[PDB]
Each structure stands twice: as structure tokens, then as C-alpha cells.
A paper describes a structure:
The OBP3s from both aphid species have a similar structure to other classical OBPs i.e. six α-helices connected by extended loops, with three disulphide bridges formed by the six conserved cysteine residues between Cys17-Cys44; Cys40-Cys101 and Cys86-Cys110.
However, the interface seen in MvicOBP3 is not recapitulated with NribOBP3. Instead the three chains in NribOBP3 are in a filament generated by an approximate three fold screw axis perpendicular to the crystallographic three-fold screw (Angles 117.9, 122.4 and 119.8 degrees and translations of 28.9–29.3 Å summing to the a and b axis length). This contact involves some of the same residues as the symmetric putative protein interface contact in MvicOBP3 (Arg4, Phe5, Thr7 and Tyr30), but buries a much smaller area (average 608 Å2) and would not form a closed dimer assembly. NribOBP3 has a Ki value of 5.2 μM for Eβf, 20.2 μM for (−)-α-pinene and 30.7 μM for β-pinene. In contrast NribOBP3 binds to Eβf with a lower affinity than does MvicOBP3 and has even lower affinity to the pinenes, which is consistent with the fact that [name] does not use pinenes as its alarm signal. On the other hand, for NribOBP3/Eβf, the Eβf interacts more weakly with Tyr30, Arg4, Tyr105 and Ala109 with fewer contacts and has only one direct interaction with the aromatic ring of Tyr105. In contrast, the MD analysis for NribOBP3 shows that Tyr30 is not significantly displaced. The most likely explanation is that Tyr30 is involved in the crystal packing/dimerisation in MvicOBP3 and is relaxing towards its probable monomeric conformation more like that seen in NribOBP3. It is also possible that these differences between the OBP structures are because of the different crystallisation pHs (NribOBP3 has been crystallised at pH 5.0 whereas MvicOBP3 at pH 7.5).
Numbering used by the authors: 1 to 118
Write the structure that this text describes.
Amino acid sequence: ASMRFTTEQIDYYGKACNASEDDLVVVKSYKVPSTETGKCLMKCMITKLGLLNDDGSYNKTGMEAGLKKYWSEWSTEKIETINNKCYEEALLVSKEVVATCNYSYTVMACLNKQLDLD
């Protein structure tokens, strides 16, 4: 189990963020675009899902709700376990760090790591 989005999810949320075609192709290949806004597509996407607040910080309640909505095959216990761990790490991260486009990938990595610990 990982946090990867499906092709279709990427297409839909990518287009909701007005992705350029070239960037979109890259994101669908699970790589990070090198363009100024392409590298921020993941941030834009997960923010529309409510996983992050608008300042970029981790949204605890919004992460829980989004996990339940989009990964409903995971039990609420498993959702809460990985949420509780990642949230606590996110309390250590300042305003200037959460503002970076890379922070979204750091959050997804935390989740993926907690998923592998099962």
C-alpha cells in the first residue's frame, strides 16, 4: 500500500489545477516536473482534496477525511494510526517550510513510510 494516485485521479485533480499538458504527463509517470508550477502540482492537488491547509501545513482533520473518502478500503484504525504519526511530525515544520512545493512530497513520504511499517 502507498499513497499513489491513479492515472484518472491525477487527470481530474491536475486539470482542476489547470495543469500544463507536459507537466501532467510527468506527474502521471510519478516524477516531479522541473517547471515552476509543475513542481507545485502535487501541493495544488492535495490542497484541493483538503489534506493540507491553504498555507501548506498538514490538516489533521482534513487528512483523516480524505483518507476515509479516497482509500475507503483501509480500516479507520489504519487511517488513524498513520494520520496520528504524520500529524505529530508536521507540528515540527515551520511556515516557511510548509510553503514550499516540496513539503507535499515530504508529507506523502511520511504516510508511505507508515504504510510500510504494516
